[PDB]
Amino acid sequence: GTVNWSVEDIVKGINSNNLESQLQATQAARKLLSREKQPPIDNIIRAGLIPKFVSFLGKTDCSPIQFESAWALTNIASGTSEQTKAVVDGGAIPAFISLLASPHAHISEQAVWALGNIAGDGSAFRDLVIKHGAIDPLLALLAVPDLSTLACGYLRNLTWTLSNLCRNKNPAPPLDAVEQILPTLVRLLHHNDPEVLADSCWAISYLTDGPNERIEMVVKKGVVPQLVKLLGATELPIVTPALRAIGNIVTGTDEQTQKVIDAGALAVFPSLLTNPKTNIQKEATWTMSNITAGRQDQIQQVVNHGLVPFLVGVLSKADFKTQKEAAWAITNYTSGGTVEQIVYLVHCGIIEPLMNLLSAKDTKIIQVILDAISNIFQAAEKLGETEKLSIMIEECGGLDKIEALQRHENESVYKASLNLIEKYF
């Protein structure tokens, strides 16, 4: 019936003075735009069909053509920024927001979906969707006593669109919009659908990616314990954004960091720091590095949880990117730690894998490591066990690598390495 029409045929039908002919052509357009293999989005745009689709959104008397055009427009907006813009330029934003109040759930859902694509394009369209007043009717769709009564697909789409309203960073979403969305977000974070949980976590990770005032808005909502729980989920699509959120949070103040420690996050890290997915190991190690950048009592918690052997482990063997984060974690630790904490690090076997990494062709990690060596020697000086440390480094081949780094391209590398030898070797 409406399968595989030409764009010419679609135009002919949409241009007829006949609502049913228009409906059939619009459905034909939706099927064209729904195919996986290279939908002719630009041809549809160039035919001038977007204003027609947008006007069909307003035809309350013909709910089928509202749905078909919403779907068609959704899929145009799912494309490039230029394609999303064409949709916005056709006046689609206020028309979709009006459709959020549709009596027909499949139509309001499609409107939710379309707005998600538009907002997902970037900060500007996100903020434009917010200015046209989308947040109130979106949240109203979720104002039910029990989220479980909503259709599953419907709830997932709403959650996904809300997360796009939270997404992107220059600038971040308006503070008032974030304040408005957060309580619904907190509630979605306690829902039992894995996709809803994933997208809720993504939203939270977006909101916590910024200055500490942004982090505080989220932390004040009391979500950290729920995030830590989700950190232990079996589903990788949930663990990943939960961990990003937790990692974001510990980039904050010592007090914000202490919240994730208090919530029991550290007991999950034996698994996270040995996780089969390299991205999880990397994010977990980055998170650890920011925890070792905290107070001495926070470093002590890392110790108590037995995580220093796991850091030695990752420094010893991991994807290089993960190893670099471990290097940071160690340099941070040795920077803020007590002498006893630093001694403990050495007794856990940090020196050999630390030295092994000095042969990396990455000048940044070298500077990081040399700094760590320095810090450990400073602690060893306060103990007068500098001799013992120098030997340890020599016995595992460290002195060789440090000797070589004296003739290094980078200024501060050459400097730091010579300084070490001229003071300890």
């Binding site: 899929n75 394009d121 997404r167």
Partner: peptide, 10 residues
Amino acid sequence: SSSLKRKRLS
């Protein structure tokens, strides 16, 4: 992440 944009398929 999760996708920026989503096409609705048949």
